[PDB]
Design a protein around this nucleic acid. Structure first.
Lengths: 306, 206, 152, 168
DNA sequence: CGATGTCTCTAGACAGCTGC
DNA sequence: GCAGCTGTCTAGAGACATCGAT
């Protein structure tokens, strides 16, 4: 049944932009997302269909927004019961960073294209909110795994460290993205506060040290915190530019675009604080990897007061 | 009979409003055997946002006078007005001095729960509800004791053991008061709860 | 088991829907195999359905239908305590009355007393000039006509 | 000293908190009356923070971290609403109060860094909340500047980490 | 406890930039 | 010659962050 629907999509998607009839595309994409639900796990047709929607994603370059959003949901509603989606999320984050600019706007990211769907336009909240939506889901179940972690214990720690290691590579390549203003920035700041709450796994292992966990903090120290603070030095100017477009009270738009920043600082230090407890107790110094905490001050420019 | 007919008849908003304000104006003026049909009508027939203060008007009407179990059944018939009653006693106790009818209807809604006990804890931390009134209530209105309803009220002491231990003493006092009236089976159930208390838990409730 | 199920329906109000499913399952199992307590189970479920309309309460009617289609004689064993339930025409008779009558259809048919009670309650309900009461009356009429079969 | 330091900070913070809360320009001649109070309050706070520099005793730092955080939070909650309306009535004196506050609270980040460097378990426990409160102050100043349409007059800049009365 | 405002957007319109 | 066509502006509707204490 899907094969005939597959034929309709491949013919319709390959058609010119003048014959896109978006209403048809949304329904046919959703019709697959509903019919693909009941495909059994123990079938090969699961795979060639799954590799087909991946290969259709690698090749096709669709500029519609709801079309991209709907199709991605299907891919993430099926690559959630077969394997670990973090491999896909990383690849999506690889493309978003390549597609958009850079957080430091000084070093040029290589113009790679893991997916052709993500263009100069689709890297907008269209995709960046879905990726962070999936990333939140992965972190949500990891909390359950961490809850379960707190002879079978060794196996649990293997996956969590491996997944979080991949998950950290996702956010590291995603926090370096030059995100536009709006809710996409706000989601990243809050989601960064979630992944750090890394704290619970550290908090559990206080009961014990393993080399794999040390490598994770080595990764976390060298991939998240120094890059994370660079984001805050950037969000301050993108909101200053966004705040000039007021009536062109404001108190709503000043205590709403900056609220995540204090919370992210607190999450970093709380994770940083529990490293102190482990470093002393576990008789191993694991802080040479990371750097000193950075804070910020101001000086009201009274010269340009009026 | 007019309100009974309008109960039988359907409802239209414009007339319902004026007739219902007229009813509220004429609830307390009649003998205690006559207004219960009016209260039952406004309970199971009328439901609106203004009920949150109409029930306060009813509380003021019934404040003085406080066998007459028809009001309880009328409140049983509907539950949304009971939630409105909880909302009203959230602020009625904030101004009025916890009349006996307030605690009676609070027991009734707690019987028919989570919001009631949240309100109870809040006013435990707020004003501790001088319990002489409820002592008089258990002295005169013991016909609705039925320990299953005040059992949760007593076991709320366990949640009230984190702080404010005086309210635990007040709960002990009111279980002492409720024991010495009637209901020998309820008395033995109370003794069973007390031996449960001396068995499980720390030495405080012991 | 029966206390656990009673408080399961109490604590319901998706994990809550799964809790409803588990409670219905355990209640049906303990009703099907336990003889002297099935009357107690029927009394508990009859006392639990009343004064419950804000939360989705379709579970009560559906498990009642299942347990009466598995064992219809329990109500007569309970001396037909469903007569008091006829007052539900004022709480929420949008779908609960229809499902309840659907469930109790065979026991209304076999038992003449409950049929007489139903016809009299609906006869006094129909001429009540309330929209809700008339809706309940017509809903009951929709079922009572097909309750009795003579076509063949 | 540490007993004196504890009681002095506690009393100063309590007196600062006891000041009446925010008001939407309800009364004239009060928006300047209730600014000299906070001027002398921040003067006292700066004096105490300077007195920290001579006595680096661990209980002294433990007191200072917590009570500086509490005083900063109280300032943000109470004085700043007054500042929103009083900025138009009075311009330089409120600015001077802000300069004094930045002069004082800038040392608290140095104390947090020093606590983190020495891995003091019993002293680093207060770092995160204080750092969050300092960031909250940094951005609430932006909010106050927005209350009077002064948005190009703000510049949040990186703070160079320093040792207690030292460097780095 | 959670009603509410804020925001990505998809289209339509009549109105500015094509034209005429 | 003022007849044609070409697009940001505005209202629809739906999802989210904090909205503001119960």
């Amino acid at each position: 049944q899907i094969r005939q629907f597959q034929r309709s999509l491949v013919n319709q998607l390959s058609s010119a932009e003048d014959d896109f009839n978006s209403k048809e595309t949304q329904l046919l994409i959703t019709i697959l997302s509903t019919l693909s639900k009941l495909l059994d796990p123990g079938s090969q047709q699961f795979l060639q269909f799954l590799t087909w929607t991946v290969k259709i994603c690698k090749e096709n370059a669709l500029e519609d927004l709801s079309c991209c959003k709907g199709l991605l949901t299907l891919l993430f509603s099926l690559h959630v019961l077969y394997k670990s989606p973090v491999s896909l999320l990383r690849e999506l984050a690889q493309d978003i960073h390549a597609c958009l600019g850079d957080i430091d706007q000084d070093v040029e990211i290589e113009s790679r294209s893991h997916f052709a769907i993500v263009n100069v336009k689709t890297a907008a909240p269209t995709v960046c909110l879905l990726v962070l939506g999936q990333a939140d889901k992965v972190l949500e179940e990891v909390d359950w795994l961490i809850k379960r972690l707190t002879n079978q214990t060794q196996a649990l720690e293997k996956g969590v460290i491996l997944q979080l290691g991949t998950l950290l590579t996702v956010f590291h390549e995603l926090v370096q993205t030059a995100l536009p203003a709006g809710s996409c920035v706000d989601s990243l700041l809050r989601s960064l506060s979630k992944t750090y709450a890394l704290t619970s796994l550290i908090k559990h292992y206080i009961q014990a040290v393993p080399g794999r966990l040390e490598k994770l903090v080595k990764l976390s120290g060298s991939h998240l915190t120094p890059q994370c603070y660079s984001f805050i030095t950037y969000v301050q100017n993108i909101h200053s530019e966004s705040l000039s477009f007021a009536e062109e009270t404001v108190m709503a738009k000043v205590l709403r675009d900056t609220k995540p920043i204090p919370n992210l600082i607190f999450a970093i230090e709380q994770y940083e604080k529990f490293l102190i407890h482990l470093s002393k107790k576990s008789k191993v110094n694991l802080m040479q990897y990371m750097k000193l905490s950075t804070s910020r001050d101001f000086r009201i420019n009274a010269s340009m007061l009026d | 009979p007019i309100l009974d007919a309008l109960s039988r008849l359907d409802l239209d908003a414009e007339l319902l409003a004026k007739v219902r304000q007229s009813a509220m104006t004429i609830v307390p003026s009649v003998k205690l055997e006559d207004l219960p049909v009016v209260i039952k009508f406004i309970l199971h027939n009328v439901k609106a946002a203004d009920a949150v203060e109409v029930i306060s008007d009813l509380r003021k009407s019934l404040d003085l006078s406080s066998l007459f179990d028809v009001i309880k059944l009328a409140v049983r018939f509907q539950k949304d007005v009971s939630e409105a009653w909880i909302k009203a006693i959230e602020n009625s106790t904030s101004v009025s001095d916890h009349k006996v009818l307030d605690l009676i209807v609070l027991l009734l809604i707690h019987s028919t729960r989570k919001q009631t006990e949240k309100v109870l804890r809040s006013k435990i931390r707020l004003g501790c509800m001088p319990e002489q009134l409820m002592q008089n209530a258990f002295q005169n209105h013991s016909m609705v004791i039925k320990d299953f309803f005040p059992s949760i009220l007593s076991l709320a002491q366990t949640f009230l053991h984190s702080a404010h231990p005086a309210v635990v003493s007040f709960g002990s006092c009111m279980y002492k008061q409720a024991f010495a009236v009637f209901d020998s089976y309820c008395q033995q159930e109370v003794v069973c709860a007390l031996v449960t208390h001396v068995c499980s838990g720390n030495e405080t409730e012991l | 088991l029966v206390d656990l199920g009673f408080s399961l329906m109490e604590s319901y109000e998706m994990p809550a829907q799964q809790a409803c499913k588990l409670g219905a399952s355990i209640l049906l199992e303990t009703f099907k195999v336990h003889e002297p307590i099935r009357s107690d189970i029927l009394e508990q479920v009859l006392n639990r359905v009343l004064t419950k309309a804000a939360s989705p309460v379709s579970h009560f009617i559906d498990l009642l239908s299942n347990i009466v289609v598995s064992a219809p004689l329990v109500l007569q064993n309970s001396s037909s305590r469903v007569t008091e339930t006829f007052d539900n025409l004022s709480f929420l008779p949008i779908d609960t009355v229809q499902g309840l009558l659907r469930a109790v259809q065979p026991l209304l048919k076999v038992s003449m007393s409950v049929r007489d009670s139903l016809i009299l309650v609906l006869q006094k309900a129909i001429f009540s000039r309330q929209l809700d009461a008339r809706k309940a009356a017509v809903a009951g009429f929709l079922l009572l006509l097909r309750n009795f079969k003579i076509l063949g | 000293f540490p007993v004196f330091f504890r009681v002095m900070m506690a009393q100063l913070e309590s007196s600062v908190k006891s000041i009446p809360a925010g008001k939407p320009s309800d009364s004239g001649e009060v928006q300047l009356e209730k600014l000299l109070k906070w001027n002398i309050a921040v003067r006292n706070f700066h004096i105490l923070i300077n007195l920290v520099k001579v006595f680096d005793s661990r209980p002294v730092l433990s007191i200072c971290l917590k009570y500086g955080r509490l005083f900063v939070e109280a300032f943000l909650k109470l004085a700043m609403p007054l500042l929103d309306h009083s900025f138009k009535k009075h311009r330089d004196d409120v600015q001077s109060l802000l300069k004094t506050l930045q002069l004082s609270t800038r040392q608290l980040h140095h104390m947090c860094g020093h606590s983190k460097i020495h891995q003091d378990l019993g002293l680093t426990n207060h770092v995160p909340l204080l750092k969050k409160s300092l960031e909250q102050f940094v951005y609430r100043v932006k909010a106050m500047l927005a209350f009077n349409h002064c948005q190009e007059a703000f510049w949040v800049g990186v703070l160079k980490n320093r040792d207690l009365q030292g460097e780095e």
